[PDB]
Homo-oligomer: 304 residues x 4
Amino acid sequence: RNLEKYKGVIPAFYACYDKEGNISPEGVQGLTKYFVKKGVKGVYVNGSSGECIYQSVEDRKIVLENVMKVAEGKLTVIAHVACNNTKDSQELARHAEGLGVDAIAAIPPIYFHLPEYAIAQYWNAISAAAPNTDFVIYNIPQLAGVALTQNLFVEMRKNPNVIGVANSSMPVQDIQMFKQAAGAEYIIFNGPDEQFMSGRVIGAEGAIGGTYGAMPELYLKLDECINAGKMTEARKIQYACNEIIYKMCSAHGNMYAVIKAILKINEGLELGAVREPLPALVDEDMEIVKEAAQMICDAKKKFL
Amino acid sequence: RNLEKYKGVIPAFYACYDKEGNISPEGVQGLTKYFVKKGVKGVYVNGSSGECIYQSVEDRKIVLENVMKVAEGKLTVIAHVACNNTKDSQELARHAEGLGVDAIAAIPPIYFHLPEYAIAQYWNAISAAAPNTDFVIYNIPQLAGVALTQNLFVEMRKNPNVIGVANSSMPVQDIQMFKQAAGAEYIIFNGPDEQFMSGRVIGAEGAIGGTYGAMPELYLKLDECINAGKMTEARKIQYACNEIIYKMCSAHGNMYAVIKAILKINEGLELGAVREPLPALVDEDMEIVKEAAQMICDAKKKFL
Amino acid sequence: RNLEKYKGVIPAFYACYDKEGNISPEGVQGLTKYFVKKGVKGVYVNGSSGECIYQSVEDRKIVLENVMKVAEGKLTVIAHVACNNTKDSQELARHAEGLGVDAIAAIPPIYFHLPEYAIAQYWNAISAAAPNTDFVIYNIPQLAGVALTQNLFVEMRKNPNVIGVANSSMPVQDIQMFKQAAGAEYIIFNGPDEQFMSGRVIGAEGAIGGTYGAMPELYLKLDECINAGKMTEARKIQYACNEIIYKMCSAHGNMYAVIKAILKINEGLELGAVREPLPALVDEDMEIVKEAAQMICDAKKKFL
Amino acid sequence: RNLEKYKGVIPAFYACYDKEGNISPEGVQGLTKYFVKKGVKGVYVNGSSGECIYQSVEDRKIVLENVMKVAEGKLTVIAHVACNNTKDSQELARHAEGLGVDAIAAIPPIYFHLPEYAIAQYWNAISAAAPNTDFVIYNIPQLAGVALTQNLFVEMRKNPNVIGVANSSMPVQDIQMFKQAAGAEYIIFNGPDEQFMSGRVIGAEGAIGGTYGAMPELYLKLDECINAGKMTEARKIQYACNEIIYKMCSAHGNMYAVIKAILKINEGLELGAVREPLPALVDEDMEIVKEAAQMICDAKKKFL
Ligand SMILES: CC(=O)N[C@@H]([C@@H](O)[C@H](O)[C@H](O)CO)[C@@H](O)CC(=O)C(=O)O
Ligand SMILES: CC(=O)N[C@@H]([C@@H](O)[C@H](O)[C@H](O)CO)[C@@H](O)CC(=O)C(=O)O
Ligand SMILES: CC(=O)N[C@@H]([C@@H](O)[C@H](O)[C@H](O)CO)[C@@H](O)CC(=O)C(=O)O
Ligand SMILES: CC(=O)N[C@@H]([C@@H](O)[C@H](O)[C@H](O)CO)[C@@H](O)CC(=O)C(=O)O
């Protein structure tokens, strides 16, 4: 199995709202054009970074449709289709296959801690609604409250559409164990942005992150140093990216609200705000937004 | 402030489905008639037990409408209105006020761990969409991933519609601390069914549970023994209820799937199945359903 | 099996030091005389409250010897004998049997998370070093990092010296499950002082606490109200005891440092300080010590 | 500040017992000779891997004395001196300085979750008992139950003897954050063996592990590939070491019991068993011991 189109930097795609807080087709297209021009491997659409939790099935369809209008044939497209219930997730998995996305992805069931067999049934029911599309399993125990165990992964590998795991848990051992267990026909994507270099070297051939969109060139360059085996140059970029993450996370407003504001300053992008309950930016946050935006420009000057 | 209508046994209302898996208006009405006949203080509608997580805003409106259509009697109605996003929760809080429910309730934001100010903003935005209705804060850290802290509770007590907390966390100290801090104009509802008697004596004047619907008379009798100060007889009913809970939880199928099946055997109620991803009953579960239904009949005979 | 001598209030015995920080035989004797005069059911010697973690095997022998030298009266003596390694725990279990203590107690192995079979081997090796003495399993997962599971408890009940569990975990369901499973020949001791009344009514016939020593009469009165079925008066004492606990815990200095200081003010007892690494009291703590000591006097006046 | 002598592979030194379970001076010397001949940077003496938790102050003195007789001037020596109480830890810190060890190390206080100021006081009291010796702080939240926070680390950096952190927590971000915060005059040691390569590239210039002693050459070679920037060869060794770890951890007997047994098979070393409560090997474990020992020989043949 050939998974080359999934190897590299795949930024998680942000939610693009107009001035009223509705999904902006124009906004979505503009952010996709930004990603095409920046030369990233692909986009991870309607994930946690895309505020999926807060969107309707229709909101999520519009996002993907407008992503495809611009990225179809140009970028690799992974659409996250998981919803609270199974029927909404199946509708999105069907819709995604209709647009010809490269892969569909799903986080586990949330809120309740469902047994392993219920998680496997949920994922396979989604996969069956898109029977010709590749499938990425999301391991995010911090948020979902349930983890992808080695046994659940063995069970999921029985589904031939399953191409691998997007690992957002903090231990890099999880990436190593998933990779070693699955072998060469599977791909592990690195989830913690702050550990990008560490996840990549231990076996993650993929990378999906929520902070990539704020500085795509830094991650591409980081990935370039990793591939070259230039670890000192990699370490130096990693520390600069993390220093920016910690700054974006020190705000009152949500990290994604900070990022959208940065993209206005650095790129003239109009992405709207964050959907409630995510906290919006306050006046005091503007200095944080400006300092982080400048840290990005300064890190690009220093490392590109 | 008078909170007498909230004191006593308030079973969490189950998700009543037709044979196609859609909300059954007929089904909802029948389960409401059941609770009226059982003489419970009220009903907690569209909570976790009512599979709220898996319902649409429209599904949740239909449930409440059909509950109210029958709750002409002595049912104190608490409608849980919290949804993944704020605008869906506001729509439900408005709709509930239009039907004249006694109170509205909300779990915290889920999946992401939002700061305290974002949680308070979420709850107050819901409360503002129903400005004349009483408000219940739901503390369920096991599932929501965030807890109602003492400071967040002090902050929420600034909202005059807030009448108290529905405490589902395991420490009874949480009930004691919330009660002591809030005083006499507030009510704490006991969430863990298995600790009913323990929560009640330390200060919970209310009780909301997901297993009450399966044996309402046992809990009413338990509450009667508590009020009388009959601790030995309370203990005997508590242990019998918990013995039934552990049996209902030993099934492959979800606890709520087991309960609906029991209500078919013991009360001829047609409630449908559980919505996916909740796991349905399997053939092996039929014996557990039959045995727990009998344990209920035998416990009623022994204690009523 | 008759366990009447273990039913009631059993304060955890504090580490009595001389002005040089060494075990005070005189000090120990004086605190034992205190508990005899206070009319408590017994004493729990060399537990976490007795700073066992920080004592040598010799320190722990001296404490028990001087307790026994005075516990001529009606003190049911439970000696905690668990040490980091097994051989130190066996030496203490043997020594305790030589002094004719009523029971020996043990926390699980700490620091490393040892499998269930290693925990059972540890406890049975201790029990075998005192083959004629009663045995108490201590469940304290917050501190030990391992919990007494239902299966480990079934395994331990094969040892005839095991008389029950001292439950310090926060869920009262743990007391209920241990009691229901073990039956009438076993005793469950209530560990969380702040939930005393809640633990007692759900099935704990015993009570061991670290704050009992600071206000023995309040707990005795609380227990008296419980037994009488006076839930309203029990609640009033419970809330007054918890209000004192939270005040004793608001200090910079360790809770046990605060308690010893209170016993100096209220009972003229000379108990020394707390052994490092436990933090000592600071100047700012004197007011908290003075206020909590007064809260104790005022609560005795109000409830006795 | 020059920390070159701490950079590289520093295996945690095992507890060497004679046939009765006492500390064997001859045994200790023999294991030190093994480490000298294998060409590792140094040894981490009386850590968790050296069963410190289960040793007396005298046991720990004998170990270090016999380590020094053989390693003094030849290997870098880091002695872990932390005990349950402060006075035992000070006695060991003094004793270690008397033998002229390169550095002393300490885990935080255990069992109780002590406030940050109590942890800092504990470590500085140890450091003051060895005022001319370098100091390594151990971050091991999984076992200690308390973590080294960024604030506690800022506080500890005020002590000029503090040379860095030995990070055993699972997130590599912890290594990155400690390093970035401390700068060039500090060293971070990698604790999780299974993430060696990942910890090293993100900023850990040091490495201390409990499995190093079982295959020193594999880790030295791994470290050599890392330094060369040969990441594919590094990944291949990492996966082979982890495959051996998982095998050593699948036994009934404790991982350290398995390692000592392997050193008997592969090196003819007589290290004794593990001190109770650590579980000993069973007959069924011998096949696991032999297979893992062979996996070591086969991995050395394949990668050296
Ligand atoms: C816990 C979490 O949200 N993890 C993020 C990270 O990319 C995260 O934004 C980053 O590491 C900053 O903390 C992703 O793995 C998940 C994500 O972007 C998505 O699913 O949309
Ligand atoms: C964690 C949880 O779901 N707890 C239950 C308890 O009533 C009960 O202990 C549970 O239903 C059965 O054990 C409720 O608090 C939740 C509930 O009824 C609701 O929110 O609808
Ligand atoms: C976690 C903990 O230490 N709990 C205490 C409780 O008695 C009490 O809640 C605590 O001392 C004060 O809150 C006891 O169970 C421990 C104890 O007294 C002992 O082992 O000596
Ligand atoms: C949690 C734990 O014990 N971690 C170990 C690891 O080296 C461990 O043995 C290894 O990663 C295998 O799991 C070390 O970091 C600690 C250690 O060796 C010591 O302090 O002696």
